[PDB]
């Protein structure tokens, strides 16, 4: 009959189409004839029925199987072929006379419904194939009545939360084609879905609109590295030039900083290549304009971006020369290049293009001077240019004694300017250090400058004591000078004078701006003379206790540094402050989250001292670990990250350090379980802190012996037994279950006495699966017992 003939005709196509794409265009050609004739004889439903039947055979095939992929493409090519004939008759405006429209609308509608019968099937393979078929025909189904449109959206909206990420990706692909609801559904998945590959699918296929771009670029911090890399590898690359117009400049700068500072190399290189190769090319080799986009005047990312470029493109590097003609049109971009090239070539020793590309020191001193005159005889751009040239000047070549004096008399006149901005005092003094032959030549020239500023102030007064503003200038200059001094004060007499004449009076009076400078100047001197540090330990304790948050900030840093340089000889003795007194100063600051900036200095500072062994008090070290796990300090990311990096290296650097952790860790664990259990009570400000099992295996990890940079030691052993004595001191078994299950992370093998003691406790605890976990320990343990016993 003709019904079986239809089946044989369509099955023959599917039989050959599964094996190769070679004849797919011919296969569609015949399928359209089988259909057309089938409807002619009134068997439209026989064709639709058999077409469906053969498609069901590929539904259970798993994602990878090429045979399924080949038939999915055939199905899609068939529907796309039928629709193209309908689009042409509409676009070329000619009539169709064989009901092609009706047949198509009915075939599509019937086929989607058939395929949707397995959208919620138990077999994840058909659920994938179903949405794959849908995704690949969406563009070519044309206009569909509302019942089928509602059925589609509802079916997909359920598959966006499918159990398999593979089906969810396919659900994403389907919803992307309904963008313009579906757009918000995809943004909902870009932020909230746990699978990284689906967030990636949503991100890459989400329309790049002013409404959606913030959510797309938000994935520049995705926990997955690929999603972060793809922001620079594809998203930002796709935009091209629009990365400087339709992208907010504030988020723009944040994207480069993130990519260039990322902890992973793939992300770093991806962002590097986007700047050095893709962007630069998008701007037609114009490096100057590329720098205009990075905004050198208001960003420091360009320092890494251009060095990133220089590595990728050494050919452009040798083309930037600096003849005297360049200075006629000198801008912030060119000025930044001047320092960036010169410093980059010194670091990588490309001395080839320093003898012919850059002026000699004597000519650079004229240009540097010139801009100083324009400014102190747009003011922002002038100050910026002066800074860029001075940066290069500090590392310039002054072998030619003519250029050394020229540059020197230039910077001395600059540093003499009472109106000189602080950033230009800083770099101006560092240049004078490079120019000076030795420290004494440096301090003598520096103090000579300073004294002239204060002395000149007393003539305007004798038109007694120097003005307050004048003191700010002298101390700012001296602070940057003393940062570069490295000889004992005993050798420098003039610094002894500066102490009496200027520094200690500044520590005495107010406002802060003058007092803060006095403390920093003092602290820098204390680093050079141990006695001076001894005699000012009381002053610094008062500055943190009676000073604003800013004065605490500096005085605390001074205290921590005095300890780092001099050790414990500034404490506990005749004429010396008490250690325990300073311990209280740190503790009071460390726990005052009213000002969290200082907590990091206290948190970090104390880690620095315990690490150098300058500090070694068990009770204080315990206050640190608890402030790390504390719920009040979750707000302070810097503090948590400080403790997160310090206290692991402390243990793992020397066993005496880890030995300290072992004695405390049991008491620490105790005092955080009691805590969390009390965050259930009716007194709050729980998920604001880790749950004990996390804390335990964290604690246990630090106490593990082999993680130290030569013997078993059993430092970890002693920690555990402590953890077992404290045990049983709990309201809720839930946290007992936590502490017990995470055991067996131990390293066992010597020292008989200790392990037998450990067994005795474990036996005592033989009082729910926690029982299994503990039994796992004793059987392993009992083996160690008989082994050692028989060894004798």
């Amino acid at each position: 009959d003709i019904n079986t003939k239809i089946f044989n005709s369509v099955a023959e196509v599917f039989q050959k189409a599964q094996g190769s794409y070679a004849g797919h265009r011919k296969h569609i050609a015949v399928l359209k004839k089988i259909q057309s004739k089938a409807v002619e004889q009134g068997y439209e439903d026989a064709f639709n029925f058999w077409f469906d039947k053969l498609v069901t055979k590929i539904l259970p095939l798993k994602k990878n199987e090429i045979i399924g992929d080949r038939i999915v493409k055939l199905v899609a090519a068939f529907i796309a072929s039928l629709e193209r004939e309908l689009i042409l008759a509409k676009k070329q405006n000619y009539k169709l006379t064989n009901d092609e429209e009706g047949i198509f609308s009915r075939f599509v509608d019937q086929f989607i419904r058939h395929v949707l019968r397995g959208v919620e099937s138990p077999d994840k393979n058909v659920r994938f194939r179903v949405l794959q078929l849908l995704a690949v025909i969406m563009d070519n189904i044309g206009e569909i009545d509302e019942s089928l449109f509602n059925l589609l959206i509802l079916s997909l909206n359920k598959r966006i939360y499918d159990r398999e990420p593979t089906v969810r990706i396919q659900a994403v692909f389907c919803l992307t084609k309904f963008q313009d609801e579906a757009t918000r559904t995809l943004v909902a998945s870009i932020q909230n879905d746990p699978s990284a590959e689906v967030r990636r699918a949503a991100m890459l296929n989400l329309i790049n609109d002013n409404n959606t771009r913030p959510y797309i670029l938000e994935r520049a911090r995705d926990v997955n590295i690929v999603n972060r890399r793809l922001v620079y590898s594809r998203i930002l690359k796709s935009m091209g030039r629009k990365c400087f117009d339709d992208i907010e400049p504030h988020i723009f700068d944040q994207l480069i900083e993130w990519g260039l500072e990322d902890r992973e190399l793939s992300v770093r290189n991806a962002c590097k290549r986007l700047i050095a190769h893709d962007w630069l090319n998008a701007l037609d080799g114009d490096l100057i304009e590329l720098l205009e986009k990075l905004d050198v005047s208001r960003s420091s990312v360009c320092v890494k971006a251009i060095e990133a470029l220089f590595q990728s493109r050494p050919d452009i590097l040798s083309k930037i020369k600096f003849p005297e003609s360049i200075w006629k049109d000198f801008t912030v971009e060119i000025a930044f290049l001047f320092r960036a090239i010169y410093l980059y070539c010194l670091d990588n020793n490309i001395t080839e293009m320093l003898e012919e590309n850059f002026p000699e020191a004597s000519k650079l001193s004229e240009h540097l001077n010139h801009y100083i005159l324009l400014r102190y005889h747009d003011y922002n751009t002038l100050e910026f240019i002066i800074e860029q040239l001075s940066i290069a000047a500090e590392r310039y070549d002054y072998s030619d004694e003519v250029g050394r004096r020229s540059m020197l008399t230039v910077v001395r006149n600059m540093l003499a300017l009472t109106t000189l901005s602080e950033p230009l005092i800083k770099i101006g003094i560092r240049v004078m250090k490079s120019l000076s032959i030795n420290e004494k030549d440096f301090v003598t020239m520096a103090i000579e400058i300073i004294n002239d500023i204060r002395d000149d102030d007393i003539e305007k007064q004798e038109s007694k004591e120097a003005s307050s503003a004048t003191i700010v200038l002298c101390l700012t200059r001296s602070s940057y000078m003393l940062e570069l001094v490295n000889t004992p004060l005993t050798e420098n007499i003039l610094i002894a004078s500066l102490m009496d004449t200027l520094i200690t009076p500044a520590v005495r009076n107010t406002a802060p701006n003058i007092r803060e400078l006095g403390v920093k100047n003092l602290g820098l001197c204390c680093l050079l003379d141990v006695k001076l540090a001894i005699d000012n330990m009381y002053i610094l304790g008062m500055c943190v206790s009676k000073g604003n948050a800013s004065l605490k900030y500096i005085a605390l840093q001074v205290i921590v540094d005095i300890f780092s340089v001099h050790g414990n000889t500034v404490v506990d003795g005749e004429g010396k402050v008490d250690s325990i007194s300073l311990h209280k100063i740190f503790y009071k600051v460390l726990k005052n989250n009213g000002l969290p900036e200082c907590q990091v200095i206290a948190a970090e500072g104390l880690c620095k001292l315990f690490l150098a062994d300058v500090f070694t008090d068990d009770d204080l070290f315990e206050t640190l670990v608890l402030s790390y796990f504390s719920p009040i300090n979750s707000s302070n990311e810097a503090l948590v990250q400080a403790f997160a990096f310090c206290i692991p290296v402390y243990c793992f650097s020397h066993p005496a350090h880890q030995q300290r952790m072992s004695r405390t860790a049991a008491d620490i664990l105790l005092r955080l379980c009691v805590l969390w259990d009390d965050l259930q009570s009716s007194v709050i400000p729980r998920e604001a802190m880790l749950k004990p099992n996390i804390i335990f295996q964290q604690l246990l990890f630090w106490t593990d012996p082999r993680n130290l940079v030569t013997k078993k030691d059993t430092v970890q052993l002693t920690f555990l037994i402590d953890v077992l004595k404290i045990y049983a001191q709990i309201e809720k078994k839930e946290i007992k279950k936590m502490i017990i299950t995470n055991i067996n992370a131990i390293f066992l093998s010597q020292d008989y006495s200790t392990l037998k003691e450990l067994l005795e406790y474990s036996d005592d605890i033989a009082e729910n699966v926690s029982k299994n976990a503990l039994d796992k320990l004793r059987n392993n343990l009992n083996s160690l017992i008989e082994e050692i016993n028989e060894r004798s």
Partner: protein
């Protein structure tokens, strides 16, 4: 596999793909669908050994 015999009407239980699923879990649990973290990394302050070994007021100098 080898290939598919599209001429087989014998194929038994191929309509099994359209089963109901009763008590087979096909939806991800409702807890995981939304997360407050949005799966981003926190702010990063880059605490390195280079950072810590240096003094506060004199970053050029290092300590042991």
């Amino acid at each position: 596999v080898l290939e598919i015999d599209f001429f087989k009407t014998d194929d038994s239980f191929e309509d099994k793909v359209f089963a109901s699923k009763g008590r087979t879990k096909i939806d991800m649990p409702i807890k995981n669908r939304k997360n407050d973290t949005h799966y981003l990394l926190p702010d990063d302050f880059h605490f390195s050994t280079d950072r810590i070994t240096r003094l506060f007021i004199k970053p050029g100098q290092k300590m042991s």
